[PDB]
Design a protein around this ligand. Sequence first.
Ligand SMILES: [Ca+2]
Lengths: 54, 108, 48, 38
Amino acid sequence: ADDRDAVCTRSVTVRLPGLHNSLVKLKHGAGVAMDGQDVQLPLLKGDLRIQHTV
Amino acid sequence: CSNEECPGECLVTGQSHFKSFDNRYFTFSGICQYLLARDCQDHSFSIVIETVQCADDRDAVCTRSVTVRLPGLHNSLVKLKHGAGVAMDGQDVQLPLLKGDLRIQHTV
Amino acid sequence: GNFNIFAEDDFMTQEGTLTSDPYDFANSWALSSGEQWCERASPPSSSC
Amino acid sequence: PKAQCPCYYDGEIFQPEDIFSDHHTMCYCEDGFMHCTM
Ligand SMILES: [Ca+2]
C-alpha cells in the first residue's frame, strides 16, 4: 500500500531435518512448493500432510 | 514434385488399433507392458505403455498409463496416468511445468 | 453354467474366473441392444 | 453429483461404470467405492 507503515508478509519457508533436508515454501497464493517443484494437493509422506481446507 | 522427408506419427486409439510410423494399420490386443518406441541408436528417449482388459469381455483391451524415460534429464520417469494426472519420479505435479528442455502443459 | 457333473465349479464368469457371489457372476453376462443400455442390478433391499 | 462422481484408486481417477482386470484383480466401481475382488 505504498505507505510508510503498511507492511505485510509474502511467503513462509519451513525446514524439517526429519525428512532428510526438506524445505517447503508456502507462497502468496495457495500454491505449495517442495524443493523447488510445485505439487498438487493432497500430499502424503512419512509424517507430513498438506491439504486444502473448506 | 521433389521428394522430401516429413514428420511421421504413431497413433494408438480405440480398443486396440495401431498405426505404424509409415502407414500400416493393425490390431494386437495383448495384456502386458510393451515397448512402444525407443531411440534405439543413441538412447535419447523411450516410451512404454501399459494395457489392461476393459468392458468385461474377451476382446476389449485398453491402455492405462504411459511411461516416458528421457536420459537427458538425468534419469527421469514421467508417468501419464488414466486421468489427466502427471507424475514425475513419484511426485504429482501441478501444470504447467518448465525445465531445461522439457515442457508439459494443458491444452484447450 | 457349464455342463459337467461337478456342481460346485459352475460359477465361472465371462472372463474365465471363478467367483462366489451369485449376483456379480450373473451380472457378467449382460447384453445390450441398440436403444437398450444396461446398468448392473443390486440385491433388493427388502426383508420379511 | 449424487452417485455420478468419479472413482479414486491408486493414483488414477476413474469414471462411473468402469471395469478393468489386468492379471490379479477384477475391479469396477459403484457409487464412489471400488469393490475390487480377487
Ligand atoms: Ca458343472
